[PDB]
Amino acid sequence: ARNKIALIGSGMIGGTLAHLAGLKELGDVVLFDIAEGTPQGKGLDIAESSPVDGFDAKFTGANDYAAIEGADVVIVTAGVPRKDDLLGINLKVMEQVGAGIKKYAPEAFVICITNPLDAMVWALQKFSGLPAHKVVGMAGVLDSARFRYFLSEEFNVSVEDVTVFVLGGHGDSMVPLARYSTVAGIPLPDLVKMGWTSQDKLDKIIQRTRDGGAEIVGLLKTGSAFYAPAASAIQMAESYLKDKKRVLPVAAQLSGQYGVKDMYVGVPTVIGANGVERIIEIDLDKDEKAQFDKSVASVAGLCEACIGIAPSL
Amino acid sequence: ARNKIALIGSGMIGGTLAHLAGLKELGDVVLFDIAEGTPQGKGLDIAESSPVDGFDAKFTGANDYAAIEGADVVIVTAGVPRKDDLLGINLKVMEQVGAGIKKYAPEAFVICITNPLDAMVWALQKFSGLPAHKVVGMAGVLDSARFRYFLSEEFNVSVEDVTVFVLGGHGDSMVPLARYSTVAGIPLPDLVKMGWTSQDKLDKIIQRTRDGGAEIVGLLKTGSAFYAPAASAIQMAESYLKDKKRVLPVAAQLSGQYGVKDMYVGVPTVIGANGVERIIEIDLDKDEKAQFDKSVASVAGLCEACIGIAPSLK
Amino acid sequence: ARNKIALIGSGMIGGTLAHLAGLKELGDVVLFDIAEGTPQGKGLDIAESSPVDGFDAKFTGANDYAAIEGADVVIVTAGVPRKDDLLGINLKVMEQVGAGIKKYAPEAFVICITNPLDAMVWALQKFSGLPAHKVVGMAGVLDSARFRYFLSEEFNVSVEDVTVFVLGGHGDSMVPLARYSTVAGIPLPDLVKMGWTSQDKLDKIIQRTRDGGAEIVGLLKTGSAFYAPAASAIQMAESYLKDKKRVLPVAAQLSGQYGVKDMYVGVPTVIGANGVERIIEIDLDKDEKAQFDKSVASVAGLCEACIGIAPSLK
Amino acid sequence: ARNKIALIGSGMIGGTLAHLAGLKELGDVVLFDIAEGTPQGKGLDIAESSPVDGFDAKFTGANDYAAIEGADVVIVTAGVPRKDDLLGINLKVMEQVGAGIKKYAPEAFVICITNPLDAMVWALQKFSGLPAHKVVGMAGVLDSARFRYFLSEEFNVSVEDVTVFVLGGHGDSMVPLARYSTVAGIPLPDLVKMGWTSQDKLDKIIQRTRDGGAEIVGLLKTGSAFYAPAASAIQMAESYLKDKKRVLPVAAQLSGQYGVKDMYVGVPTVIGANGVERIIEIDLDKDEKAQFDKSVASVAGLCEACIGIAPSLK
């Protein structure tokens, strides 16, 4: 049987996941949503494109969780946009999604995209009852992609020769490690030394990565980023389906690493056929650990606020 | 230097064209639109995705035609949705687009998507002044893709083993030839004989292909198809850029084939580094010819109504 | 767990099978051979190449059949070159390979390449005991590739728009059907009618296809084709592994189709996750049927000679 | 016009270069060789494979240099195998090849593979007269692919997540910098401190990389590596053809960097549409600089012995 990918949410990211899953031949695709017509429509549009590029994949749109039965991978974008209270609405969505995955796809590898990410993934894991190593959040890969793109422009090198090291969440909760970020193995601080850029331009690049999501919103005005997010989650899915062992920053349940337990945090992980196969642990200096703890504190509060709304957690 | 692809219109199809061009490494991409922010945002979004798959391409969003200068391929989706009324607004858009291509990308291979396709490509070729062999419309490839998909489902074979032969435009203007459509070389009427499906099911499949665009609109409610249309236009672009000589049904200027001159009609064509390098003419039986003539006549009616609005087209 | 591909034989075709399996990310690859070092060397060379393109697959060389345990697909090129005595040595190889698959990969999709193909795949099925729908021979896809390529050059169209219909085996045992061969849905005889080529040039292209293997041998002098044969077998394997339902001409066990039972014959088949899922049966006119029966008769003679050598095949 | 890739030498690597150029749709390919039949045979074999995957490319075999005319990229494997009189035979070959490039493809980007690489590329640049930034040697990418592969195994991570930094040539001429080699951005010496590996294992992986070519020869017995070498050279061609700006270790002409002038040394370089666009110069500690100087001196001595065989190089 082909692999089966279920996309819970058929909006801008959802459609893009479907398209990419088709193009990359990851397998059959189920697009789920509460909106009638939307998933069916996008699913049939993508199916109808299949003969052009030559991929053979079933695309199904559905409004019933039974359609996700036996999904090897589930990618969750279901939620509402920030048009505080976002927490309350999206948490109720995670509850519906969790129960749906619990019933129909308990063996799935689950990638959460819904915001606020680190809390929503934490809640989805508990509501679904899936083992934590099989439930992760997409955030870090997106920050890393933006950062790499900015640097590839700064140095006029290939994106393929830029590596960045990122932990935490987005924005002020991101913890970049310049010293573990390189061009062809040469770390960013030495590139500054060599005159390839300046520390001020690197600081602006770092700040632009923090604000990267907001920059896209400012440009589109009517929505947020969807290509790079979608590409990011597909890469995680792909490392699972192909047992690739990529090292990828994702929101994963920590159990002692970095001094944190029972909470999702953005960390470098090795992704393979068993989900999060390994959490990578590096030393952080005082300032790094300062930012790190600050994000954990912020996410702790969101999770507590979620416990407020849903004591079942 | 890399190939340069200019996308005139940065909407649902436009953004998809850009994503596909990035993924397939067809070259650098300019997203153009009149809306500020939109092409800049989609362009940067896609650029930002590029380290994931490792493609190297520049993405630029622009609100100025000068950004398209020297484009090897121009793909046009600029226009407004249908919420003869449409004709007038989109015609004026083809005039602006035409003038920008003439000025900044005169050597471009141009692929028109804007509806109503059959008149807009013909108008766009005139306004722009480009040689007709370098200006085509995307329609046939989409209808063909839908048709093939439905057949692959009916027979449970790979999409790559289904071929269909489509003349004309969308809907009632489509003239599909079942006898030149095949699974692995076996024509559809033979597959009907062998019991692989029935004539009534084949008939419904052709009808579904006619109504294909409207089926997606009914599902989406808020807009129309964009993934299959984009994929279709990108396939045409790619045959040009790679000098592939794919046989693709496109809206092309006829000059004698099928008795038709000075008009764009959907016909299978060989697309290579010189654009429309060959239009394929087959013999039609009397019924098929009558279907083809009705479709061409309806396209001529649309073009004449464009002339009434923009006399410079005459 | 990744798919596992076992290559029984690590010569020219085998090494190409491994390379393509890596490049296309079909899974982990075991190269098996009788020669020590050859499969280990090639496997490590291809593994060392993997960081360039970024594919992650394990490559193992082995001289022990236990290495092939649990293989999803097994591709067999083991044999010796013609340097009816060939039949004898290669039948012994099929017996060893058969026993090794039976013991270690009884659930594999098995693709036979070893010559002479039509007898060897039939012998290999019997020796191995695998269900016949999981054991096929590569042949038709190669004749088909050659033919398509030659036509694509003749007409100067993309290889992607050429389809050919080929029954039987290589050389004089090939039964090509020009009428079920097309460019963009247009059968070759209509293309002759339209002036795209002549009957005499089509006849020559057909004969070139019969002689295709020998033409490569004539050029290389030291051995035979390996790129197109490897590509052809890999396509078959992918259709299985992706459940793609491609229609491919392969040597398959017939059970009534075309009046044939209990023999392997080159026929267009749908290949999916269950192996040979459908064997396509068309009607043949009187001349085509005579050509087909003559081809089947010479395959029956070859199998009878194999029974002569190895009575356990009776 | 499609890109044109000329392959000077149609042996094991040559054939593999051709196949990969086909699969990756890099352009039309000319296989050239002194041996009649070989390049025509390999060329036709690969062309015949092309309808399977659907790439459209011309493959030509030739024994006349005029076939390479206007090549965008020329990759040279022409020479004889190692069975200082090798230096003399292969130098004579570089003379012929250089003269054919000068006459027929003076604007080519040229990639040398012929051994001994460090002298042959230098000598090939001088014979052909091409600008030095357009003539490079393939070496470092190969050592780097092997290195990364061995590391990916030790750490159980994707090959895509390992980066290594290699100066100099193969074997004892290699100068690897563990401190600019990484897993996920984390340098190797730090990984040793973290317990993910030991200095012993790391030293053995370095030594294994130095002996990597000889390890493959010890396994194959009758030949040397060809898959990883071909993949490495193709990555270099591709970065040029796509203006990718990949950072790749290649043998390039230094003009002041690391204190070296008028000599080809393995250094990481930016490769784009103008060939060697930037040679990366880092600071070296005293030990690293001694290793580098010893490697460069041994390259200088080889080139001096070439000047004694062919005084025209002085």
Ligand SMILES: Nc1ncnc2c1ncn2[C@@H]1O[C@H](COP(=O)(O)OP(=O)(O)O)[C@@H](O)[C@H]1O
């Ligand atoms: N309870 C729910 N279950 C499933 N889908 C939901 C639920 N609530 C909202 N959605 C859907 O989630 C999708 C969110 O899409 P969108 O707003 O485009 O954001 P994104 O950028 O994450 O794609 C919409 O298609 C919406 O209908």
Ligand SMILES: Nc1ncnc2c1ncn2[C@@H]1O[C@H](COP(=O)(O)OP(=O)(O)O)[C@@H](O)[C@H]1O
């Ligand atoms: N005169 C014009 N010039 C350039 N772009 C235009 C013009 N008029 C409309 N557009 C743009 O064309 C795009 C059409 O996109 P959309 O409505 O999503 O349809 P489609 O599905 O064809 O992409 C919109 O982004 C709109 O801003």
Ligand SMILES: Nc1ncnc2c1ncn2[C@@H]1O[C@H](COP(=O)(O)OP(=O)(O)O)[C@@H](O)[C@H]1O
């Ligand atoms: N009994 C056997 N078991 C396994 N491999 C065998 C056996 N006999 C021969 N071989 C191998 O089969 C391979 C045939 O390769 P080669 O002669 O290059 O032909 P091809 O073109 O079919 O690859 C060789 O590697 C050879 O050692």
Ligand SMILES: Nc1ncnc2c1ncn2[C@@H]1O[C@H](COP(=O)(O)OP(=O)(O)O)[C@@H](O)[C@H]1O
């Ligand atoms: N003067 C020359 N010009 C062109 N080709 C040559 C010349 N001398 C030798 N060759 C060819 O170079 C090729 C080297 O191939 P091969 O020995 O397989 O080594 P590799 O492993 O580098 O491909 C052979 O095909 C040989 O015929």
